[PDB]
Structure formats: structure tokens, C-alpha cells
Amino acid sequence: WTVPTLNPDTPSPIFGGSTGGLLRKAQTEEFYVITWEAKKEQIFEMPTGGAAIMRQGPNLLKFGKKEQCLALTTQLRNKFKLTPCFYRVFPDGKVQYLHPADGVYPEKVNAGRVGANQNMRRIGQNVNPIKVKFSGRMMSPAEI
Amino acid sequence: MKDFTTYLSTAPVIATIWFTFTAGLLIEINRYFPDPLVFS
Amino acid sequence: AHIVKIYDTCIGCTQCVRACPLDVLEMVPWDGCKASQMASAPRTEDCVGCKRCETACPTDFLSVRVYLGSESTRSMGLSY
Amino acid sequence: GMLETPVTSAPIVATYLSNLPAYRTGVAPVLRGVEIGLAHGFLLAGPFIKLGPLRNVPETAEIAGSLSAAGLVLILALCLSIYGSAQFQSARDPLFSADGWSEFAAGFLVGGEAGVAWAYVCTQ
Amino acid sequence: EVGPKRGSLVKILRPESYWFNQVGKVVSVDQSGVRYPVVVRFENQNYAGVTTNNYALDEVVAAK
Amino acid sequence: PFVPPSWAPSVFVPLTGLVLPAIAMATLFVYIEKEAP
Amino acid sequence: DIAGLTPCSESKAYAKLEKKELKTLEKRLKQYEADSAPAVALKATMERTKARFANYAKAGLLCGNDGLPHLIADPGLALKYGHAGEVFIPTFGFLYVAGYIGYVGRQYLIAVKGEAKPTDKEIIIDVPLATKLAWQGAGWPLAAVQELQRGTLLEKEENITVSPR
Amino acid sequence: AKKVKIAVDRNPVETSFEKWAKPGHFSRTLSKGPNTTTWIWNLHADAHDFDSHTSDLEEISRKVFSA
Ligand code: CLA
Ligand code: CLA
Ligand code: CLA
Ligand code: CLA
Numbered sequence A: 001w002t003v004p005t006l007n008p009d010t011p012s013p014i015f016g017g018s019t020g021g022l023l024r025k026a027q028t029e030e031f032y033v034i035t036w037e038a039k040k041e042q043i044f045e046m047p048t049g050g051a052a053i054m055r056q057g058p059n060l061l062k063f064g065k066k067e068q069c070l071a072l073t074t075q076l077r078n079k080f081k082l083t084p085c086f087y088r089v090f091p092d093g094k095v096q097y098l099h100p101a102d103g104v105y106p107e108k109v110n111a112g113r114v115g116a117n118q119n120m121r122r123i124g125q126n127v128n129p130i131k132v133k134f135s136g137r138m139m140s141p142a143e144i
Numbered sequence B: 001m002k003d004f005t006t007y008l009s010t011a012p013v014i015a016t017i018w019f020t021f022t023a024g025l026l027i028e029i030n031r032y033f034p035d036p037l038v039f040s
Numbered sequence C: 001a002h003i004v005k006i007y008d009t010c011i012g013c014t015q016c017v018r019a020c021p022l023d024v025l026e027m028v029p030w031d032g033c034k035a036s037q038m039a040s041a042p043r044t045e046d047c048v049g050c051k052r053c054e055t056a057c058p059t060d061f062l063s064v065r066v067y068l069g070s071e072s073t074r075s076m077g078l079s080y
Numbered sequence D: 001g002m003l004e005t006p007v008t009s010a011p012i013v014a015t016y017l018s019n020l021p022a023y024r025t026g027v028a029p030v031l032r033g034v035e036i037g038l039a040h041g042f043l044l045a046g047p048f049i050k051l052g053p054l055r056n057v058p059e060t061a062e063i064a065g066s067l068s069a070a071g072l073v074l075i076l077a078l079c080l081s082i083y084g085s086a087q088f089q090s091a092r093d094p095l096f097s098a099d100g101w102s103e104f105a106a107g108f109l110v111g112g113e114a115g116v117a118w119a120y121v122c123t124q
Numbered sequence E: 001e002v003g004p005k006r007g008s009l010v011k012i013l014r015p016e017s018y019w020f021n022q023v024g025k026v027v028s029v030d031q032s033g034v035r036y037p038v039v040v041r042f043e044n045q046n047y048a049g050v051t052t053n054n055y056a057l058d059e060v061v062a063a064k
Numbered sequence F: 001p002f003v004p005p006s007w008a009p010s011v012f013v014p015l016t017g018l019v020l021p022a023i024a025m026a027t028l029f030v031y032i033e034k035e036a037p
Numbered sequence G: 001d002i003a004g005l006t007p008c009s010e011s012k013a014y015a016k017l018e019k020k021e022l023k024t025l026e027k028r029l030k031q032y033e034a035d036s037a038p039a040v041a042l043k044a045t046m047e048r049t050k051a052r053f054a055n056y057a058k059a060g061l062l063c064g065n066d067g068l069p070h071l072i073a074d075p076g077l078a079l080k081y082g083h084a085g086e087v088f089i090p091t092f093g094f095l096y097v098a099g100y101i102g103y104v105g106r107q108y109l110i111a112v113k114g115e116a117k118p119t120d121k122e123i124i125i126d127v128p129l130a131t132k133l134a135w136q137g138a139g140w141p142l143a144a145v146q147e148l149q150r151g152t153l154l155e156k157e158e159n160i161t162v163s164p165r
Numbered sequence H: 001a002k003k004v005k006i007a008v009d010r011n012p013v014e015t016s017f018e019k020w021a022k023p024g025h026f027s028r029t030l031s032k033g034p035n036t037t038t039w040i041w042n043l044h045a046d047a048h049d050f051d052s053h054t055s056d057l058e059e060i061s062r063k064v065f066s067a
């Protein structure tokens, strides 16, 4: 498996538009693109409101925040048995592939993943806040 | 009949009967011993 | 960004990963539990702090914990 | 993606907006403020003159109403000045720049005060 | 061989557990050397609605 | 000598109610939107 | 008398209050005929009112300047001056009934915790069991002391859940 | 075109006091009995939410009509 490359030419689902879509943040900060392959034309629900028709084959939609792309991913995966992926697109044209991060969806354990933010103790074994006082900022005993 | 008497043993029904009885006892005492403020 | 930590009481049931609406968590190989897998929090810059993961965790007390931290556009969930 | 309506996308509407000094690029920012200042300064005297605390006084009403409108123009000019200071700290239209907005604010003050004065002349 | 017998009663000693100082019934004890092999089931559910949890060998003591 | 002039309220009340608050708000507004290096 | 109060039987305000209350009823009684039902109801109220003021004075209640009975709560003053029936005796009447209710409920709770499904006996009452316990609760003061002396009333600290400290 | 006509089912539900003595029978979640006091409140909040007890539209309609 290798990181896919976004194709901006991909056609988008049939949709008449709405007032729930992108704002000035997309022009200045970042936006998100989700793509998937559809087996047939089918009506699905937009996370921004309304019904859209996915074209047979490649599809492409743009969203304002990451949660919107993953919300549609959950719908497509569970209700239609599809395998979408999405990216983060910066105003200068840079594209950052996001999901699934390593080609395998996170709920399925995969080799080569390195644990992060794992504490080798129980919650009840955290130290008292007095022991981390005056550490340079506000920090919980769970941060050590 | 077993099931019906089981229904009558549910909390709301028992509470209704018990409080109806308790209220009746308190009302009837005040009917025959009106305006009690002290014990003599 | 919020702070998400996984503790060694995890049973590797995967329910926190399935419940995360932001894809913050994932399952990695482990040897400390029967399932031989542990939850991980590699992408905490995207955590919004909803705590759906904590709601999904079966262990007592929790094995995944969210500590709300500094607020950015991502953590605040803004689309503008 | 976006919802297009006759109000949002119409030929008559679009042409009218482009003619307004706010959207008329290629014009010096100071001139933009003066034209915008004159329009707003003239109308502002109306409500103060007809509904102020001295409205019923025969001749003082015109002076007080226009004089109060002039004070509101000064406050508005100060609001423009600080807005430019905050918004522009670090492009095609010179108006949206630190130097351009300052000139635009200055024009609004001169135009606004003149508009108030012109309104007073019309009354008397 | 390791841990209490299946079906026996144990007392929970984990302070942050909902069932601390309460009694549960042993379901099974993993022999694979996991951190928390003892599985205990309780009559009363915790605030999350769960009635079973895993504990270490030293976090359970025979009831009574 | 301590007695202020009879006209002091006419000046100080507008000064502390309209003028100084206006300067304080303007000064604070620019300060809270200023961008650090 | 106690705390500057005076007996209601000797209080002018107390006597005046009764006249006003009866006077109010008498005014209403004028507009009705002698045998009509409203007249019978009003006169019955008047008889109850006169009995009430007669009984309270007979009981020896102390009246304030307002002419209203005032109760005495200190056991020493109440027992010294014959006011024990105002607060002191009613005190032990309540505590007997209240403990009766509490003790009977506690017995039922303990009895059903040995059943297969204790929670089912709390929403569907075991009326035969509840009835038996209700009758036996008349001796709760004796039963409660014996449990206190036997060390069975209270549970041991090692069996009570607490939060971390 | 479907003819407009009367159409019923004979004896769909037996008349019995058995379910009166089984609180929460109507719901799959609550029929197992209480473990906490929240069960008691849930019993009453869900009592008339017919469509949350089943997906059959016919079953819902009959309950509405007799209610
Ligand atoms: C909305 C509520 C309201 C309204 C309508 C008024 C109205 C009035 N107040 Mg009162 N007042 C209010 C609330 C209000 N007050 C409150 C809450 C307080 C307590 C703080 C006071 C305290 C107060 C005081 C102390 C005084 C007044 C006075 C006045 C009078 C003059 C105000 C003035 O000069 O305005 C000037 C108005 C403007 C500059 C704004 C005009 C807005 C225009 C008309 C909008 C038009 C939009 C347009 C349609 C858009 C077109 C778009 C496109 C087609 C071009 C006037 C009768 C004064 C007086 O003497 O009264 C007799 C006075 O001394 N008020
Ligand atoms: C302590 C604060 C303060 C002070 C000193 C004033 C003072 C005044 N208010 Mg009030 N006001 C205040 C707070 C204050 N207000 C607040 C907080 C609110 C919001 C709730 C209001 C809302 C309010 C309303 C709604 C109205 C007033 C009005 C007035 C005027 C009433 C007297 C009159 O008939 O004027 C008549 C007007 C004049 C004699 C003109 C005086 C000079 C004008 C205002 C400025 C001229 C500036 C000049 C051209 C250029 C700058 C000169 C400078 C550098 C020296 C007066 C100027 C009334 C008014 O007329 O407002 C304009 C009025 O309608 N006020
Ligand atoms: C809730 C607290 C409380 C308070 C503030 C009082 C207050 C009082 N009590 Mg009471 N008393 C109480 C509870 C209380 N009592 C209880 C619970 C009981 C039952 C055990 C009694 C039994 C009682 C008796 C038997 C007598 C009083 C008496 C008194 C009065 C004078 C004695 C004295 O100094 O008492 C202050 C109270 C205390 C320091 C607390 C303990 C009081 C003990 C129980 C009684 C002490 C009596 C005293 C030695 C008598 C001296 C001779 C007397 C003629 C003055 C005084 C107004 C006397 C009185 O005036 O009777 C008419 C009296 O003879 N009380
Ligand atoms: C078996 C019944 C029972 C008993 C013996 C007790 C005993 C006690 N309660 Mg508890 N309690 C009960 C039921 C009971 N409670 C119920 C049903 C509730 C919910 C309303 C509460 C809510 C409650 C609170 C909020 C508090 C107590 C407290 C207390 C303590 C002090 C007394 C008090 O404040 O009573 C007050 C009593 C009540 C508020 C509710 C009484 C309701 C009825 C009368 C009880 C019996 C009803 C039951 C259905 C009967 C079953 C009979 C059976 C044959 C079928 C004491 C240990 C206090 C404490 O912790 O003190 C240290 C305290 O803060 N109780």
C-alpha cells in the first residue's frame, strides 16, 4: 500500500448546493476533500443538509472541517459498504492525506503502528497535583 | 387471578391504597376529634 | 490541543476507536492484554474533546482519558 | 456547493454594487472615503434634528441636531481609524492595507463633516 | 493454578473501582501472564451500566 | 483653596464619562488585537 | 407566668378573638332561613368554634398579647407547669410512629435481600411478607436496642464502599 | 386501484393480566427489570412512545387507534 494522490478533476455528486457549505476559512486556512468509488448511482445525505446523488465511479466532495468528512465516511461505510478516503488541502495547494492513515482503518489493528500517549499505569496511580506545581505551565499529573 | 393480584402489589397501586387508607384514618380522626392542638 | 492518554487497563476492545468522530485513536499491537492490542492516540491535534471515547470504554475505571487543553480552530470544531 | 439565487447572482444587482464607491477599485482610498463620508454625513443629521431633546425649540433644533450628528461622525471616524490599526498589521486593492485604510478613514471624516454641514445649509 | 478459584467470592481492593470494598464472583483467571487476569462479575452495575471488570491478583482478596 | 471652581462638574463629568472611556476603549482594543512578534 | 405569658382563660385578647370569629359567622347567618341547609352548616361551625376556644382554655394554654396560644418546648418548664402535652408528650408520640415506619421498612429490605431477585421485591411488594412485618413493628424500640447491644445494627467499615482520599 | 374497504385481524392480542404484572414489558431494554432508580423514570417516559417499541407501522397504528 502507498499513499494515494488526490485527483482534483474527479467529478462530484449531483447536488444543487446549499448554504451549509464552505466559508472564508477554506480560502485562507484549510479545507478537506473526501473521495470514494461508487458502484452505482445512489442518494445519500449530505452532512451539511440535503440529499445528493453519488455518480457511478469516482466521487469528490469538499468540506470545511475534518469531522464533516469523517461523518460522511461513516455513513458511506456502514450504509453502502464503501471505502472513502479524505485529505487536508491548504490554500497554497499542498495536500495532506489523512484517512485511513496507513491504508487500514484504525479500528483494525495493523502492524507497523507505534503506540502514542500510552501510560503504563492505571489512572489511580497518577501523582498528586502538588508534585507537578511550578513546572512552567498548567499541566495535569497525567501528563507525566 | 394470580397475575391480577400481582398487579395490585406494584409500587404505585400499593402506595395509592396505603395513602388512601392513611389519609382516611387521619381525616376520620379529625372528624370525630376536631381542632386538636395539644394532648390532654 | 486536548490531551488524550491510554492506560494499561485497556482490554483492546476497540470501542473507543470506533466511537471517535475525529479519527484521533487507533489500535496497535500489544502483549499486555488477551486481545494483544492496545488503544493509541497518535493524532491528538484533531481531538475536539467530545469524550465519546470515554463513554465507550468498558473498563472500570476508564482506560482512555481526555484532559481538555488549549483551544485552536481544530479543537474548537470551527468550520470558519 | 453554494446556493445561487436571483438576489445573490443577478445582473442588475451585480452592476449596482460595482458602481458603489466601496467596490469601485482604481479610485484613491481618500476619494472613496469622501464619497462614502458625504453620503452618510448628510443623512445622519435627519433623525437628530427631528427627534432630539431640542426638537421643539424653533431655531436651536437645527443647530443642535446637526451639531450632534457632527459628533457622531467624529466617533465613527475614530472607529475606522482603530479598525485599520487592528485589521492591518502585517492586497490588490489599496483600500485593504494599513496605509490605504488610514487615508480612507481620513476621507470619511472630511466628507462626513462636510455632509453634516451641507445638510444644515439645506435646512436653513 | 494462579489466582482464586472460578465461582468463588472475592473482595475488590482497587480504590478507584466502583466496587471497591464490595464482593463479586470470579468468572475466570487468565493464565497467560496478562496484567489483570482476574475477571469478576457483580450484581450491581456501575454508573456506566457495566457489571464485569478485570483485576490484578493483588487487587482481590477472598471474601469473608 | 481646596474648593474646585464652580464649573468643574461641567468638564470632569463629560471627561470621565465620554472622553476618557473612549480613549481607554480605543487603546485597549488595539492592544488586545496586537500580534506578537 | 412563664416568659411573661398569661393563661388563655384569663386573657382579654383571647376572649375578644372568640367574639370576632363568632360575630363573622353570625353576620353570614342572617341572610339564611332558620331551617335551610346553609343555616345548619353555619351553626355547626359556630358550635365547633365555641368548643375549640373552651377546650384550649381548659387545657391550660398560655396566650401572648395577641391572644393566641403559645407552646412551651423546654422539658423542665413543660413538666414543672403542666405543659407536657404541648411538645414533650407529642415528641415521643412521633418518635414511636416514625421509628415504627423506619424499623418495619428496614426489616423488609433485609428480608428480601436474601431472595433470588431482590430488586423485583421492591417494585412488586411481597404483601404477605410486608403485612407480617407491619404487625411485628409495634415492638421496634425493644428490638432496636437488642441489635444495638448485639453489634448487629451497624455494618463494619471494611464492607462499605468509599471513594479515594 | 385499491378498493376502499374494511379490513381487520381477528383476535390479534389475547386479553390477559399477565403483562400487567410485568412492568416494562413493552420495551426490550426495560423488560429485564430495574437495577437502578433510572429504570423507574424510564418506564414512564417510554410508555407511550409506541414507535420506539417496534418498527411495524401496523402495530403502531393499532396502539394509536385504541389509545
Ligand atoms: C429602539 C428603541 C428606542 C427608540 C426608537 C428611541 C428613540 C428616541 N430616543 Mg430613546 N432610548 C432608548 C430606546 C429608544 N429610543 C433606550 C433603551 C434608552 C435608555 C438607554 C433611551 C434613552 C434615551 C435618551 C436619554 C434620549 C432618547 C432620545 C430619543 C429620541 C432621539 C434619538 C436620536 O437622536 O436617535 C438618532 C438615531 C439615529 C442616528 C439612528 C437612525 C436609524 C435609522 C432611522 C435606521 C434606518 C434604516 C433604513 C430603513 C435602512 C435602509 C437601507 C437602504 C435601503 C439604504 C428618539 C425619539 C432623546 C430625546 O430627546 O428623546 C425625545 C434623548 O434625550 N432616548
Ligand atoms: C457620562 C456620560 C454621558 C454624557 C456626559 C452624556 C451627555 C449627553 N447625552 Mg447621553 N448617553 C450616555 C452617556 C452620557 N451622555 C450613555 C451611556 C448613553 C447610552 C445609554 C446615552 C444616550 C443618550 C441619548 C440617546 C441621547 C443622549 C444625549 C445627551 C445630551 C443631552 C443634553 C442635550 O439636550 O443635548 C443636546 C445636544 C447638544 C447640545 C449637542 C452637544 C454637542 C454634541 C453632542 C457633540 C459636538 C461635537 C463637536 C461638533 C466636535 C467635537 C468637539 C470636542 C472635541 C470639544 C448630552 C450631550 C441626547 C443628545 O442630544 O445626544 C446627541 C440624546 O438624544 N445620551
Ligand atoms: C436544648 C437545650 C436546653 C436549654 C437551653 C435549656 C434551658 C433551660 N432548662 Mg432545660 N432541658 C433540656 C434542654 C434545654 N434546657 C432537655 C433536653 C431536658 C431533658 C433532659 C431538659 C430538662 C430540664 C429540667 C429538668 C429543667 C430545665 C430547666 C431549664 C431552665 C433553667 C436551668 C438551666 O440553667 O438550664 C440551662 C440548660 C443547660 C445548661 C443544659 C442542661 C440542662 C439540664 C438538663 C437541666 C438543668 C436543671 C437545673 C439544674 C435546675 C436548677 C433549678 C431551677 C429551679 C432553676 C433553662 C431555661 C430548669 C427549669 O427552669 O425548670 C422549670 C429545670 O428544672 N431543663
Ligand atoms: C426503609 C426506609 C428508610 C430508612 C429506614 C431510612 C433511614 C435513613 N435515611 Mg433514608 N430514604 C429512604 C428510606 C429510608 N431511609 C427513601 C425511600 C428515600 C428517598 C426519598 C430516602 C432518602 C433519604 C435522604 C435524602 C436522607 C436519608 C437519611 C436517612 C437517615 C436519617 C433519617 C432521615 O433523614 O430520614 C428521612 C427520610 C426520608 C427523606 C424518606 C422517608 C420515606 C419513607 C417514609 C420511608 C419508608 C418507605 C418505604 C417504601 C417503606 C417500605 C415498607 C415495607 C414493609 C414494604 C437514616 C439512616 C438522611 C441521612 O443520610 O442522614 C444521615 C438523608 O439525608 N434518606
Ligand code: SF4
Pocket (backbone or CB within 6 Å): C004, C019, C020, C021, C022, C023, C024, C025, C046, C047, C048, C049, C050, C051, C052, C053, C054, C066
Ligand atoms: S474526545 Fe472525542 S475527538 Fe477526542 S479522542 Fe475522544 S472521541 Fe475522539
Ligand code: SF4
Pocket (backbone or CB within 6 Å): C006, C009, C010, C011, C012, C013, C014, C015, C016, C017, C038, C039, C053, C056, C057, C058, C059, C063, C064
Ligand atoms: S474502549 Fe477502553 S478498553 Fe476498549 S480499546 Fe478503548 S481504551 Fe481500551
